[PDB]
Design a protein around this ligand. Structure first.
Ligand SMILES: Nc1ncnc2c1ncn2[C@@H]1O[C@H](COP(=O)(O)OP(=O)(O)O)[C@@H](O)[C@H]1O
Lengths: 258, 42
């Protein structure tokens, strides 16, 4: 028994890019709703990423966590690769941040809690996942976070989320994910990342020297967490379990209610 | 509320755009629906 295109019916497109298309879809027997990501072999080969693709899908197919988009399986035909994915219906955190400009402390602490949980699980499996930019975070039907840039995409900045050890070209480890979490926490509360600048050269400077400032509305609890996360030395950044124990996180997060 | 189709009806429809263009299709189908085919006598 293998996965087959025959197993599925295909709904509206969710995104399109040079590498392919993502569709809303449905497994025929169960009527289970999911997303089908469809990748052009020609473009993959032309990009020389066939080895890289196999590695990424292999990694994602073994991650099983409520805040990570599941990859249920994959298959191919003569000209396309097909990834069977969990569907997240409420869009990206990126869009939500556009709409609201800034998040309050309860939404922020709750999102950071879900991400730290997902990342702790990833590290337990020796998986490092630094790119947790808002556009790579989907929202499930209950508004819960889903890290969505495992696998493969159909498609002075971006540097914005890089840790000092990475931009300086040194050895890096899973502690890059703690730096990301700090950048993201700041961006959630402030509406922009902390080291934003006009030029590549100047953004490098601010990161490498860890130079940033808090708006006056950012509370002491929030400043304390973000400062602990944005340490130049990776070993001085907290463990994820310590983030989940932080007083500001524990006080402001919430679990679902009426 | 969301509709689903056979994959053969969806995949590559962006690519086959020229083959999905046929003058008079909707007008002909409409008038086909409205016209009767009379029983074959003799
Ligand atoms: N499993 C999914 N559920 C819902 N939307 C998705 C899913 N996967 C991707 N998308 C959306 O489809 C588009 C393409 O996604 P992807 O191929 O991951 O590239 P991107 O880097 O733009 O997210 C994006 O808008 C993304 O949010």
């Amino acid at each position: 028994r293998q996965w087959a295109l025959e197993d599925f019916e295909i709904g509206r497109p969710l995104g399109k890019g040079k590498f392919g298309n993502v569709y809303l879809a449905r497994e025929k027997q169960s009527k289970f709703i999911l997303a089908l990501k469809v990748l052009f072999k020609a473009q993959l080969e032309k990009a020389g990423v066939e080895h890289q693709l196999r590695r990424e899908v292999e990694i994602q197919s073994h991650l099983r966590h409520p805040n990570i988009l599941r990859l249920y399986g994959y298959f191919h035909d003569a000209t396309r690769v097909y990834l069977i994915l969990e569907y997240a219906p409420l869009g990206t955190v990126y869009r939500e941040l556009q709409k609201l400009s800034k998040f309050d402390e309860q939404r922020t602490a709750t999102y950071i809690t879900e991400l730290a949980n997902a990342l702790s699980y990833c590290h337990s499996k020796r998986v490092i996942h630094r790119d947790i930019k808002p556009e790579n975070l989907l929202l499930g039907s209950a508004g819960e976070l889903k890290i969505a840039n495992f696998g493969w995409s159909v498609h002075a900045g971006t540097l914005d989320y890089l840790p000092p050890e990475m931009i300086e070209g040194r050895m890096h480890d899973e502690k890059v994910d703690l730096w990301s979490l700090g950048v993201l926490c700041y961006e959630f509360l402030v509406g922009k990342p902390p080291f934003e600048a006009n030029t590549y050269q100047e953004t490098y400077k601010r990161i490498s020297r860890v130079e940033f400032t808090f708006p006056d509305f950012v509370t002491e609890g929030a400043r304390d967490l973000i400062s602990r996360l944005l340490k130049h030395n990776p070993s001085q950044r907290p463990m994820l379990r310590e983030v989940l124990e932080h007083p500001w996180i524990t006080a402001n997060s919430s679990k679902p209610s009426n | 509320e969301e509709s689903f189709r056979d994959p053969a009806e969806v995949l590559g429809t962006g690519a086959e755009v020229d083959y999905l263009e046929q003058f008079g299709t909707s007008s002909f189908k409409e008038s086909a629906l409205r016209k009767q085919s009379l029983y074959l006598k003799f």
